[PDB]
Amino acid sequence: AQLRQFYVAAQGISWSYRPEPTNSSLNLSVTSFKKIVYREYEPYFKKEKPQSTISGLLGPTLYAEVGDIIKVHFKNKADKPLSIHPQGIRYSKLSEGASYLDHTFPAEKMDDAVAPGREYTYEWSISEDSGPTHDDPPCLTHIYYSHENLIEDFNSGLIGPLLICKKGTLTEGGTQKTFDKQIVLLFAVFDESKSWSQSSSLMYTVNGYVNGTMPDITVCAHDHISWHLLGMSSGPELFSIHFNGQVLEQNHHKVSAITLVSATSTTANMTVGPEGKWIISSLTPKHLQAGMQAYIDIKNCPKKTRNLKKITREQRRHMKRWEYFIAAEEVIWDYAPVIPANMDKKYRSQHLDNFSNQIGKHYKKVMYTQYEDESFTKHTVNPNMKEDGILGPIIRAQVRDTLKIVFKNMASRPYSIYPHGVTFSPYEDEVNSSFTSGRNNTMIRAVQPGETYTYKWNILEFDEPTENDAQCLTRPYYSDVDIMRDIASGLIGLLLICKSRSLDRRGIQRAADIEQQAVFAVFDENKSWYLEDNINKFCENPDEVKRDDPKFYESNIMSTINGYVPESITTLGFCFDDTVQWHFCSVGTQNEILTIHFTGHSFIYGKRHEDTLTLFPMRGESVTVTMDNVGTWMLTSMNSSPRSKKLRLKFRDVKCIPDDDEDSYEIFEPPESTVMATEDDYAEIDYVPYDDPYKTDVRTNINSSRDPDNIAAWYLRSNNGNRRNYYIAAEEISWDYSEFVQRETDIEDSDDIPEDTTYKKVVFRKYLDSTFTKRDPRGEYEEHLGILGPIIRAEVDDVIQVRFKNLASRPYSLHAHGLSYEKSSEGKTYEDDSPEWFKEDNAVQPNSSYTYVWHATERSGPESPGSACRAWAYYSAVNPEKDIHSGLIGPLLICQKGILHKDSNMPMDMREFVLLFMTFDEKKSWYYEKKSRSSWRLTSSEMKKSHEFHAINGMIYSLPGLKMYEQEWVRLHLLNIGGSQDIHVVHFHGQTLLENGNKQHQLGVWPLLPGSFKTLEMKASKPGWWLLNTEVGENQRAGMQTPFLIMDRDCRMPMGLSTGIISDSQIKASEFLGYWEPRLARLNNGGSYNAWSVEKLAAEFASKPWIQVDMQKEVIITGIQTQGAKHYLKSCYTTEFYVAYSSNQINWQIFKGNSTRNVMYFNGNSDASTIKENQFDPPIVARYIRISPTRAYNRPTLRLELQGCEVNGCSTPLGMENGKIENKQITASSFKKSWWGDYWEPFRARLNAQGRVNAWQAKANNNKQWLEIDLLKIKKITAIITQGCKSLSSEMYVKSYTIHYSEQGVEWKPYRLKSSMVDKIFEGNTNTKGHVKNFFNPPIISRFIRVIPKTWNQSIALRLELFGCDIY
């Protein structure tokens, strides 16, 4: 529980990015100088502490543990205002360090920017909420920076690691007890162009050094190393960190490559190998083009005192030599098997010398080939290896095993093989086998033609497969001499690390079909090593390289799946109740991430079924899909950019019920139960007799016309039932992008709105009838949805038959992820060979409605112990990128049983916020009619192409409806539909996000990969206005900044109408009755004429006399305490009513929240004299409130009191009402003592007291008296309210009071306006029972409060109350 005090200061240096701290006087530098960074100091800023050899620009690590309050003294020294902003802490408004309009007072604006040469102090209390849980690494790593100017401060330096660990796991010096060494790395992309001194620069660095020249990291042998990898970049950049020859453990997954996104952080294991020096690099092709490397040195330390654990079995069982002969060979290859060319390339040329059309494409690749004999004299290997194209033979390696690799280069250029993630185990030590590795342990002889040599690979007990992992892991292998132009060449491979023990080089399990190799390789022929002979010699053109391309650099590059273009890959085939093993890998020099989608089928990923998978460059990912829905489907890439879109693999799914036939085609197999071992000609007949799914469906009968009830009949074969009917339609409306931030709310970059921000686009709108004649108005729950369509929700095992009617000018359809469905209910129109009866769902014509029947099942539900609900999405699928853009998109939520109300399907457990972090390229949208356009000067001038309106739900700034209470669990359904090379790192200011499930991981920010629908849980920390934003600077500066509001926990306070705060003139009504004035209606109790009534109730509608309450200030109101008024055996009360709210007196909105009607009809009060309390489920913010009765007993008559809290601040009783403020805290000078009155003691002044109420009194009745409030700590006091005392056959109260406040209790600093040193006179009260509320223009941030009754009517009396919250 120790307090950790750190000292930092942002100071200027002269950095050169070169490895040298001091090597020579003269400097030859890549263009950058004079940056600013902050470094740690000794206490009281004596002199700078020595910096580590590794951390050049990386700041000091501010280590801490939960329960430790850390104070950072920030004495700025650079010549620019700056600040420090954390990332994963429940920091307050005084230590946030971020400058936006939070409507906070000037006392709390000092943290946003400190002037140079002026000090401050940052306090970040760490609690159990923002700390590591079980199943979580001991130390969580975050990054803190300067929030004054995120674009300019980062690029000029100003970065620091931030570790928050568990309890008792941190030493005095900040080192974990269990880990021998901890190393902090910063893969940052510094840009000196957007810096203090603009010099053209794009250097790619680790820590503060460029070109992989950071000094080597020296570690001992077989050591436990904990890594803290940070990645930051001003623009969207992706880091794919790879530890060559090593394996790490990240989030209970043993992986060789760690993937990071800009402005993120990660921690992981590492167990070091015996000897030798390795290298770590980045697998991103543009990152590998530059250096971005670090060298890790492993030296056998004699003084290490190695335990010699020797944890190994070394017993003959479960191991075999498994010799593999993979001698590479130079071949000719056809990227497009246009003519039926099968079984690889035994026959070589058959060439027409034309790149297009028939064979003769002549893309001369060097692929790996498998042999069987020592001398390689005969090929000797020819498995049925069709549809496995340019791929090295697959190596299946068990745990504990070893294997042998032999090459014989039959090409001209020397080549090699690099086991990527295959020498993951500590590579066997060598003395001469290094083969001039270049001091990197990289075994590359670069085998010459007619040369042969052998590699040794192995594995220890600790292995990449883990308990929470797939059966077999995927890891590729390639060459090292030139990565780009050999990946562009045929030197490609893929091998598996199978945890399953029973493989024996025959097969893993002959019950799961193995469609092992599906590799999206992008071979760039313009980068091919054999370009000169290929391109020129075999065309009707002269001899020029011609790499400047009108088309060539785009025409020659071909995206293929296993070396075959998807336009000529024959359809696949798997039968019913079959498991299929898929091993994907993105290896082509695309530099862009790739996502894939299974139509009608879902994976198993961890313990989730994801239905969509994202691929990173040179990282292997393996999933297993089980066939469940009959018919034909496909795999497709959802990136769907005009570059590299057509990547589709069509696979069938048939009931393979005729098991009597023995002849099963060997590969591409319908697998029998018994395990025997101890293009064209694929998806055709002689496959086990496959029943035509289009004429033998049991789910759908095609003899008669399609009926949704008939289809849902077979779906509802169980007791679940629960049909959920949704009537939805597509309508074209004029949409606002910036109308909420035109002149108010958050800052705007679209100054003066050069365009109207009123683009026309089509959206989803829900209806209640099948006639589509009446609309269902959007309530307050969904007012944050914006452009998103209605929330379609259902339970598990349910069937959702949805009726969709097109009301636009173009055909639109409806396609839903995750949920199971027939081909008769789908939105995608591909070549599925379907009849015309399955093609009526593909496109829905205007003025026509089609009913879709989806069946929620076990695959579409959340985990067993995980989050309650999980999110999918539905969108028009006639043309996706033209349909998700233009506004056709919506959320689809599925939850476990017993969570949604039957009549209205809304979960009552937790609030749900659906946010679609996507940007809308309006050029892609339809209705993009350009008139008098092209007036823009640059290609990035106007927001039609320069800015894609980076928005959260269609609104660039200040998305409304984001309201939640503090200390409240809310469920966040973060979505990202399709997209392309755009990963959003979602950051909530002052909040930490928990990833629920079977592991319970806690994060500060979440990188949102495209196509991922991640559901999280968040607990609000403190009230106020906090900023929701993506953490990338350049996308945040121009959008994605929604200030969301966190309300007080106790927002149930009388907003007036009973105490007397609301003036008599602030209340009006539509009609009268005679002496039943609207003035009397506000009072909750008392009075002979005590309420408001009218003559009679209307008939056609409410059309009822309303009553309006004025506030002169927007406040949060949560409920209303309505009651009747009975008098002389006559009773009257409002039985039913609805409430309308508005900020001004023009735009009136009727309240409807969680109600199965057009508007809410509150249940009213059954009998008079009984206070009935109602609650508004989302609290409403407004200034005027109109409540109008709809039904009542006899003549309507109403008394009303409003409950709520003040907005944009802490307005809660700090005490003085409940027992929170002890009697021993507060006191005063002198009390009146009388025998009959006993003691008129202090500490009895409380907001409401009765009997012998003791408000306050004085035994002298003079000017110098006061009442003192002694809070335990420094608190923020906002408002004070006074109410005098009881009549007591007299009339005693105060007229005017003056305030002095102090912290130590001796200073007594008066509170006054900036006029002069005279106490400000505060308004008193006239009523004996009335409450008069006084606000503070600056809030008194102090401990002690003195209030002095300067002006008094009689013996001084006072029953005060205080409001506010704790500071930290």
Ligand SMILES: *[C@@H]1O[C@H](CO)[C@@H](O)[C@H](O)[C@H]1NC(C)=O
């Ligand atoms: C790190 O590795 C050890 C053993 O390999 C494992 O027990 C632990 O759970 C891993 N994760 C940590 C320490 O966060």
Ligand SMILES: *[C@@H]1O[C@H](CO)[C@@H](O)[C@H](O)[C@H]1NC(C)=O
């Ligand atoms: C060194 O780094 C620069 C960027 O700062 C990069 O352009 C250059 O290619 C690197 N050097 C080599 C040999 O790749």
Ligand SMILES: *[C@@H]1O[C@H](CO)[C@@H](O)[C@H](O)[C@H]1NC(C)=O
């Ligand atoms: C659809 O019907 C409406 C009549 O309600 C008609 O005005 C419209 O022209 C028709 N066609 C389209 C494409 O909306």
Ligand SMILES: *[C@@H]1O[C@H](CO)[C@@H](O)[C@H](O)[C@H]1NC(C)=O
């Ligand atoms: C929401 O409405 C349902 C019925 O419409 C009701 O049972 C439930 O109590 C409501 N929830 C809240 C928080 O008012």
